[PDB]
Structure formats: C-alpha cells, structure tokens
Design brief:
2 copies of one chain form a homodimer.
Chain A (H helix, E strand, L loop, with lengths): L4 H5 L16 E2 L11 H11 L15 H11 L6 E4 L2 H12 L5 E5 L5 H9 L2 E5 L18 E5 L11 H10 L3 E5 L12 H5 L3 E6 L12 E4 L2 H10 L7 H12 L1 H24 L3 E2 L6 E5 L5 H10 L2 E2 L12 E4 L3 H14 L1
Parallel strand pairs in A: 1-11, 3-4, 3-5, 5-6, 6-7
Antiparallel strand pairs in A: 2-8, 7-8, 9-10, 10-12
Bound molecules: magnesium ion.
GO molecular function, one term (chain A): pyridoxal phosphate binding
Subunit structure (chain A): Homodimer.
Catalytic activity (chain A): L-histidinol phosphate + 2-oxoglutarate = 3-(imidazol-4-yl)-2-oxopropyl phosphate + L-glutamate
C-alpha cells in the first residue's frame, strides 16, 4: 500500500564509505575514541550481566532515573532537567517530533550533521540551511529565525571550531523557536554552552557517550533542557529506551571523570601535534575543538589523498559535498596511529 | 513552550503499577520469562565485551545484516524481508511514521496494547478501537477498514487467545492500509501468522526477544514484511539502533532454538497446570496462547484478589478498565512460584 509521500520520496541517510573488512585498518573515519572505555564500565556491565544473565529477563528502568541523578550531579542540574536516550540521535529526532509539525521548518548549519535533515524529512518538516563565514559565524542568518527548531553542532563537525558562548547566546535570542546545541564533541573543547540552558528557556543541549566516553558500541545519550521540555520528550520516547547493560555502563562512565579527563587530555595532545605536522607538509588545517581535524592538502585534491590513505589501509572521511571535497576529516586516534598516518601522508606527497 | 498541540495535550503512557523494592517478591506483572536467557547469549556478550571493553569504542553494525540473515534462516524469509529494532516498540512507531500522516487513522483491538494509541498520539494520528465478541472476533469491524494501519496483537494480551489464521486472512483483505500482526507472544502459541506476510502485501509481523528469549532487559525486536515495506522502515530508523552487545546476544539467542523450545515447553506446561488448578477453585480462565492467563475469581472481584496478592508480596497485573476490572492478568513464572501463588489465591478465596 501507499507510504506517506515524503517517506516514499526521501533518500535514507548516506554514511561515509567503510569496507566490511576493517581488521587490518587504522580506522579514523567516524570519530571513535582511540582508547577503551573506563575499566569501571567493564566491571559494571559484568556485574549487571551476572553469572547466567538472569537479570536480562527483567525489563530495565523505564525512567533511567539513576542515570539522571548521576548526570544531574555531574552537570549541576536537577534530574528533571535531564532525559536519557539510546544515543543522541533519538533526542534529536524527538525534538523534531515535539516542536515541528509536517510542513513546518527546522534549520541547521551547512556543513554540520546532515542527519538533522534526514530526521526532518521523516517528519515531513521543511529544511533550511545556512553557511559559515571565514571567521566561523553563521552567514545570512535573519534578524529572527522563525523555524521551529535550529540545530547547532558545537563544536562544529566536520570543521572543528567552537562558537563563542556570547555568540551562541545571540543565536538563542534570535531564535523564535528552540535552539538545540548538539555538544557531541564538547568534552574535547575548552568550553561548552551548558550555562545557556539556564540563561534561556528555548535552549537544549545534547550529549552522548559515543565519542568522549568510548561507548560508540553502546547507544547512550542525553539532553539537558528546561523541565517543561524534558516532560514533553518523556511522553514521546519509548517507555523502555535503554537496556540494563547500557544503564550500568552509563553510570560507571559518568562517575569516572578522572579517566575521561585523561583520555581527553591525550586526544587533545595528539590533535595539536598532528595539526602542526600536517601544516609542516603544506596542509591547511582548521583549528579544532573536537576529536578530529578537517585538513586540505596543498593541491586541494582531498580525494587523491583519501585514495592514497585507503591504499595504505588508513581510512578517513571524505565528503563529496562540493564545499568539502577539497579536504578530508581525519579522526584523532592513538599517537601511534597518527604517527603511521603522518608517515603515509608524507609518502603520498 | 511552543509544543505541537497534539504533543502538549497527550498523556504519557501509564504502565502497570510496580513497587521499587521487589527483590523478595514473586513478580508476575509484565510477562517476563521466568528463566535466564540461553547460556550461548551470556557467552556471546562476554566475548564481544572482552577483558577491557575495547570493542565498545567502535560503532555497531548499522545494518544488523548478520542478524537479518540468522532470522531469515529461522523463519524462511530472505533477509530483505526483515528489519531489526531496539525492541518491537521501535518498529510499531516507525510503521505509523511510514504510513499514517497526522490526521490519518490507525486502529487496534480494545483490549490489547494501549501503547499503539500513545504512539498514534505522538504522530498526530486519530485512533479508533474495536471491542471483541464472545467468539473472539472483532465486534463492529467495517466491511472495509480505511485506517492506514491496524494493529492486531496475536496472541492477544491481556486475554490470551490467538486469532485463527483464516480470520486474520479475512482482516488483511478487509484492510485498505497495513495490517500489523504483533506476535510478541507467538513463541508460546500453537501456531502463528508468518505465512500471511507471503500471501498478502499489506501484512507485517513483529516479533521480540523480550518475552520468549528472556531478554526484556536487552530490547531486541524485528519486523517481517514485503521488501518494499522494510526498505521504507530502513530509511526511518536511526542508522545505529542496536548496540554491539545486543547484536551479539541476538544471534546467539536465535540460534539456540533448543533452549527456546525447552523454555517455552516448561512455560506452557505450567500455564496449563495452573489453568486447571484455577478452574478447580472456581476461577474463569480464558484459554491462553501466551505466557500469561487472564483469570477471574468466582466472586468476580479481581481487585480484591490483586490486593490480597500484593499483601503477600505477589505482583500481578490488574486493569481498572471496566471491561477487565473483574479479573487479572497473571504472568507464568516458575512452577514453584505458581504453586506459591496458587496457595495465596486459595487463602484469599477463603
Ligand atoms: Mg496462610
């Protein structure tokens, strides 16, 4: 039978290419953490699983309230300002379902997370994108944006820069609707915008454990917003959105801030070292606040270099988007992996 | 807060009541399996996790293709006719998003899974429910149902009976939109309706490992439908909807059919024994094809019995709905737990 027209017409999300066999590869294409999650996460999962996995026959916590209390203490927010999710894509999706009816508009920055658009298409919401200027400010933003939701990836991926808090504050005041600050990479930056959730009423911040907590293999994320917004999101989400092992992992991960800090320290160290090394062989590198770098070879032939890396079993991300085709987004792996990647880049020339 | 009107006005799903500390309780309120999952599942999870959880830093299989291949071999369907999900609620939700635009209608049986309505409310779809007749057929069903999606829980929960394949076939032919056969409890039944996915084009079957495979704490579900339907559902779901441990568990669970069969056999045996014992003390028990029973005491005071069980640390499910208030839905636990429950029921009856 007939699907909704928009569902029939839309094209599914197109991820970056990745070969099925990646065992013998240095994988730097999806911004995954180079280090394992906290040893406390492993213990927590094993302890929840038990000797025969009997605990898995019982439904998990629908509320994930214990996760909200731990997250609440970490960020300094009452638990009613927090909601857990099976990865942050879930909250992005539900924010659209909560605020944008079919036909209404949502917006975001080009380039950023193209999936914001895919989610809009499923809802039937219209999409409007805005580009960035040389000094990384939104170009052509109206006096007042009337879209129902605006998604700002901050720090911005794939480019890397963060937006000054005062500038995001301005954007919040100019948005008639909701401003969603996607802070997927904020743990790698020198600052974040959590304070804006308190300063305004239309600001929402999303976080995920996929990048900074080395749990991309698990789907754990959250959103921080005014209680009224969280209340609406709680009615929309599936009553059971996080399994028992994910809940055990989440609490352990958030509690081990020492490990998180050490991992982020090491990644930032490698990021800055690699930035200088790339520039030493003629590459243009955008200063980054995330766990990746957008680099452009001297000849601006990003695909040529991507092919050279692929031939050497090094996988990075290359965008066909004309705006980004000149370079590539390289995730920051272990220092050893980046030394090998640099060696390959030198051979490629 | 500028919320869509339907979102602002809707009431969030209201689950059955359950106390925080029930470690010393006999829990029979959410149809959870009384037995642990397959030992192969525990092994699979341990292997994927590894000694340091290093594998968890890498994203899972976005496609879950391996799971579809295993499920395909189990059910006799090409993998293109299958889609995996983080619990079947996810596929129920996406079926609504795929076929019912705001303002359009979806329907289901009263009583069944009220969450079908909650999901419809989020979408902004209208909801129409139909009651059942004495012979377990849908009362007042139109000659042709025009709703975009009709959800049929089969076996039906909370009542228990499965709808005969022949009758579901009739419903498929009478539905102008999609007919979704929620087979959450089919592994406990004598038969199922998988064949209808092949016979018709508008039929979809959902399954979950939450009840029959003892993995309610690791929500893994799936849907079987024509490739074109699966294709649409694949564009709607999040690219990463199942974690690495869940993918490991799913393959192991589906492959251990011996364990599944044994668990289902033990549950069916306890179910039938308990059914007989309840009738012997005056209860009316609807013949069930699931892992639960809808039982009504001789005095038709289900809430009194529920309260009596609660006082004795036995938790079942009681519905305030006038149609179901006289009885209760009792999940099937271990034989020992049901003997204790029977003893409690006899005392409450006296
Ligand atoms: Mg006594």
């Amino acid at each position: 039978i007939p699907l909704r027209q928009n569902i029939a017409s839309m094209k599914g999300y197109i991820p970056g290419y990745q070969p099925p066999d990646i065992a013998s590869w240095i994988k730097l294409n999806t911004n995954e953490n180079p280090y394992p999650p906290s040893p406390e996460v492993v213990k927590a999962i094993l302890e929840e699983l038990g000797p025969d996995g009997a605990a898995l026959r019982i439904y998990p916590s629908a509320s994930s309230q214990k996760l909200r209390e731990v997250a609440g203490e970490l960020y300094g927010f009452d638990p009613s300002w927090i909601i857990m999710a099976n990865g942050s894509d879930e909250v992005l999706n539900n924010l659209i379902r909560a605020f944008a009816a079919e036909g209404e508009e949502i917006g975001y920055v080009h380039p950023s997370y193209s999936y914001y658009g895919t989610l809009a298409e499923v809802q039937g919401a219209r999409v409007r994108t805005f580009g960035l200027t040389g000094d990384f400010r939104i170009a052509g933003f109206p006096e007042r944006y009337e879209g129902k939701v605006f998604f700002l990836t901050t720090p911005n991926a794939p480019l890397g820069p963060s937006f000054p808090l005062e500038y995001i504050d301005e954007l919040a005041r100019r948005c008639a609707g909701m401003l969603v600050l996607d802070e997927t990479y904020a743990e790698f930056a020198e600052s974040n915008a959590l304070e804006l959730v308190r300063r305004h009423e239309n600001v929402v911040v999303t976080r995920t454990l996929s990048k900074s907590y080395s749990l991309a293999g698990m789907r754990i994320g959250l959103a921080i917003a005014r209680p009224e917004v969280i209340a609406a999101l709680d009615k929309i989400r599936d009553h059971y959105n996080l399994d028992r092992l994910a809940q055990a992992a989440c609490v352990a991960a958030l509690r081990d801030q020492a490990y998180l800090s050490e991992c982020c320290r090491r990644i930032r160290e490698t990021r800055e070292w690699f930035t200088t090394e790339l520039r030493s062989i003629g590459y243009d590198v955008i200063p980054s606040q995330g766990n990746y770098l957008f680099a452009t070879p001297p000849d601006r032939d990003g695909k040529r270099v991507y092919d050279g890396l692929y031939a050497r079993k090094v996988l990075v991300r290359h965008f066909s988007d004309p705006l980004l085709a000149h370079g590539m987004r390289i995730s920051i792996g272990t220092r050893e992996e980046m030394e090998q990647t640099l060696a390959a880049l030198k051979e490629i020339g």
